[PDB]
Every structure is written in C-alpha cells, then in structure tokens.
Write a protein that binds this ligand. Structure first.
Ligand SMILES: [Zn+2]
Ligand SMILES: [Zn+2]
Ligand SMILES: [Zn+2]
Lengths: 184, 184, 184
C-alpha cells in the first residue's frame, strides 16, 4: 500500500510531513548503516524525561537509544547465550532488525534500573509522547502487526505526524500501510 | 524548476536520492529551527578529514559545524560591532540565513587554527569531497549564484548526489534550479 | 548641520539621494498636511512583511501606516482618556507631531494583534529593514535625540540612503544633523 523505498542503507516512506525511516523484520537496516543518535530526537527525549520527572515518575536520565549493528549483535548473542535462541528471537532482535539502529528509538528506564513498565507511567507515555514527536512503537495486541513483543518503554521519534498517529491508535505498519510481522 | 517546499521550519527540494534542505538568502531557516549537527554528516566528515591528513595536509580534528540561530546572531553582531555592517554582510550571514544552522555544513580548519585556504588543500576538497557525500558549497566565481562570498573551507553534506553535483561543476542553486543571490 | 527648509505644510532636508521630510517634536506637520500613504513606501513594506513571514515570524499583513491629523487627534485623545494625559504624552504623540502623518511611517503588527516587540523579530527589522528602504526610527538609547519612546515596530521609509543610515547606528536627527528632543 505505501511505497517503501530502498535507499540502500535503509528503507523509508514519505510521511505527511517528513521522510520516515522504516526498520522492522521485513525492512532491515544494512550492516553498514550507522547514523548515530539523532539530535532532534534526543533533545525531544530530554524534554519528555524531564516532564515525566516533573509529573512524579521515577524515570532515569539514562536510556537505551542508538544501538549499532555491532552493539546489537552482542546484545542478541548474549540473549541467545543466556536464555537460548527461541527466547532471544522473542524479546530481542537480530542485528539489523532493531529500530534502535535508526538513532530514532529510545528505551526509557526507571531510576531503579529497570525498563519502564508500571501502569501509570506506561499510560503517561501513551497520553503525552506525541507532544514531543514520539510514538509508543510496540503496543500489546499490535504484536502481529509490528512483529515485536510489546515494549511499554520504547519510543520512536516520528516528528510532527506523531499526534495524528497517536490519535489513530494504530501501529506505524497499519497507519502508513507497510508490512511488518515476523522475519518470515 | 525545482519544487521548493516550505516545510515550516525550513525549505527543501527532492533530490535524485534524498530530500535536500535548502538554506540561503532567499530561503531562510526559522528562528526556531535547531536540528543540531547531523550525525551521518559528522561520521563522513571524520573520514574526509582523516583522508586529507593522510594526503599530507595539515588539517585539524576540530571544525566549525552547526551554529544555532542564537550562535549566528552573536557571530553576526560581533562582525557588525567590530568591522561594521557592510563588512559583516560581506563575510558573515544574518541569523536564519546561514547554512550552518542546518547541521549539514562544516567549515574545515587547519592545525594552526585558520580556516583552510591553501590552494592544494582547497583543490583536494574540490576533487575528493563528493566521495564522502560533500560539496564545496560556495565556489569561486559562483558568488552571484549562491549569494555568498567564496569559502574554500565550507562543505555541505548532500549525500549520494554529491558525485553528480561535483561532475556538473555547478552551485546547488544552478544544479537543482532554485533562487539564490543576495537578500531581496 | 542640516539646512531644514519650511515647505509650507512640512519641513524637509536634502538627503544624499532624495528629499527627506522631517517630522518630530521640533518640526511638526501642519494641520492641513494630508498626503495619504506613500505608495512607493507601501510597495516596499509589502515586500518586507513577506520576507519577515518567510523568515518564520508571525507578522500580520495589517499595519498602522498613514494617520491623518484627524486620526491622530482621535488616537491621542483616546489615550488621554484611558490612561491619562501624562501617559498619553509618554507613549502617543500629539496631532501634528506623529511621523505617521507623513505617509512614510509604518508600525508593524503581529498576527496576535500586538505591535511587534519580540526580540528576534525586532532584531530582524534592525538587520534587514534598510534592504527595503526603511530605518527603525525610534531606538532605545536614542530617546533624547529623537524625542520619542522607543518603538521596535516602527519603520520610516527613507529610500536609498537607508543602508548608510543603518550602518551608522544613528537616529535621523544625529545622522543628518537636525534638532529633535521633547516638545520643550
Ligand atoms: Zn526498544
Ligand atoms: Zn561556512
Ligand atoms: Zn509609530
């Protein structure tokens, strides 16, 4: 439905206001694509975290943002080594198939050191994230569409179109009309 | 001929491979546009500087890249205060009208702290910069097209289309067909 | 320095390129002087307003340009009644003593409906107005010379000599060498 363009190092689509990089299990990033952390998204994340803190949530200034292909290989193999391949494929991502390689995705973490999962904090993200240009990328119940286990804590920066996407309740795959799902 | 789109904070055109932000004296950046320094351009710049050093040129590991609207206001007013308005309008750019606010423009500096101007080094940039996704933006003899005094040291990251642009020998204004020149 | 000539219903001096009407608290306009809005100045003002909007400032197409002696009488009296005479004398102008009766002066207004005062917008006028033949007439710091409270939003069309005047940093009074100051 959407026209997905292969730019070699990554795939993307034309959003209403911006080019939107598409990285998922159907649309990988090349092993060489190493854009680093996007500074517009980072600045917006810093404001979001500060807002969550002001609202009384115990959120850390530290986060997991950009993860290079090499960092992702290590993370994935560590999961394979500790919990086995089946589990790694369930909650991690093989390298090149994590949105964190875009430099536009960020996992929010509590001051306790755990990824954010508490109900009211998770809901604050759903209600507020679009004010900062972010969507909560992986919702429970959209797992078949996105291809990924739900992450209450994972934000993807999309910029101006975030409010429209949030209002729709749709995954990016449904909203723009591109395929996600499992590796096959 | 170029469909220049006003995207709100900035103008841009559709290149052959990528969207190209267009910033000059006819297409300013908003006072609120603050993207920071593009990390892809940074990564390419590291490689370029390393290659120039290997070719024997005394190039610094430090450069002048992103300048916010606020930084540009200060830089511009220092020129005005020190050399007068006429000279400031020659050497500098009014805030919102410098490509440095795009985060895609980099002034290369020698190891002595002066902007690079030496003939062989300037020619190296002209001959090699497109291999790293850059063009020498403000060419000798093109001041009437671009609107800016020539800068032997100033690279604009355009990505893959840099090789085609370099081969043409044209300013971006002429190559893509959009307005440049002085203010007004 | 300047030879100020009484032309009947107004005073003027010879500028480097054109006759420059002089209207201030030392040199008022006659009650009968009703030129209407100068259409060359208006044509330049429309281009300047368009340029500011393209630069991202929320400037209205609506402005306060020509104000006849009768209009100024009403404006002045309304301020006297609302704020009292002392206040009216500080921020308004008695009829015959406003440069707006020349048809060459224009107050720029934001789409919010307030006169322009925001810092970056006021600085844009200072940096760019002369390109359209205008000077910012009433600067902070120049009240003693001009005789008027600063107006960040008030442009006086002087034509070609605007660039030399802006570069000097002077009020018209200081630049041309004529008297200004308060009513007495
Ligand atoms: Zn994640
Ligand atoms: Zn430069
Ligand atoms: Zn006024």
């Amino acid at each position: 439905k959407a026209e997905v363009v292969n730019k070699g190092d990554y795939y993307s689509i034309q959003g209403k206001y911006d080019e939107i990089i598409v990285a998922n299990k159907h649309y990988p990033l090349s092993k060489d694509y190493n854009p680093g952390e996007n500074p517009t998204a980072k600045a917006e994340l810093v404001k979001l975290i500060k807002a969550m803190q002001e609202a009384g949530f115990p959120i850390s200034d530290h986060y997991s943002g950009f993860r290079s292909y090499e960092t992702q290989t290590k993370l994935y193999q560590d999961y394979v080594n500790q919990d086995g391949k089946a589990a790694a494929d369930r909650y991690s991502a093989r390298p090149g198939y994590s949105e964190h390689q875009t430099g536009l995705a960020f996992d929010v973490i509590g001051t306790d050191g755990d990824l954010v999962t508490e109900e009211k904090a998770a809901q604050w993200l759903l209600d507020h994230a679009a004010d900062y240009g972010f969507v909560v990328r992986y919702l429970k119940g959209k797992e078949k569409e996105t291809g990924y286990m739900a992450e209450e804590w994972h934000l993807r920066y999309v910029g101006k179109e975030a409010k429209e996407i949030a209002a729709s309740g749709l995954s990016l795959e449904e909203y723009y009309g591109f395929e996600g799902g499992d590796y096959v």
